[PDB]
């Protein structure tokens, strides 16, 4: 399994043989923008399983 | 046991052997120690498998 890793997640940065099924989180840095054109940078985390 | 003019066969065990006049020793072998859940891949060169 070739997987995405990094702060601003890039594809093909990690390789594995087992799929971690279990409850973890991963964290991403986004860039959004408002109806006012205020450019915002966000730190988010995703709890998954 | 009867053998033919080109055969091979393994002799094993606790015993004492003298070669016949029409037998050749070609090799010495050791049993390979293996624990449960451990192994090796063997090929049967006669049948290919």
């Amino acid at each position: 399994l070739s997987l995405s890793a990094g702060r601003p997640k890039r594809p093909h940065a990690r390789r594995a043989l087992c799929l971690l099924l279990g409850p973890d989180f991963f964290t991403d840095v986004i860039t959004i923008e408002t109806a006012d054109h205020a450019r915002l940078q966000l730190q988010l985390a995703y709890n998954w399983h | 046991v009867s053998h033919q003019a080109g055969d091979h066969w393994l002799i094993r065990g606790p015993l004492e052997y003298v070669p016949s006049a029409k037998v050749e020793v070609v090799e010495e072998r050791q049993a390979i120690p293996l624990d449960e859940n451990e192994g090796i891949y063997v090929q049967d060169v006669k049948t290919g498998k």
């Binding site: 070739s2 093909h12 | 060169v45 006669k46 049948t47 290919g48």
Partner: protein, 41 residues
């Protein structure tokens, strides 16, 4: 010519090994490339 598959085999009389050619660049895909699923870079 035929493909003979599966068991240990001795070429009988009047039989010879036959070389099979591959079109330009096919070999790289078969070995250098191999699985496309495992890596895509």
């Amino acid at each position: 010519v035929r493909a003979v598959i599966g068991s240990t085999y001795m070429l009988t009389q009047d039989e010879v090994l036959w070389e099979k050619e591959l079109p330009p660049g096919v070999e790289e895909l078969l070995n250098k490339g191999q699985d496309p699923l495992a890596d895509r870079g």
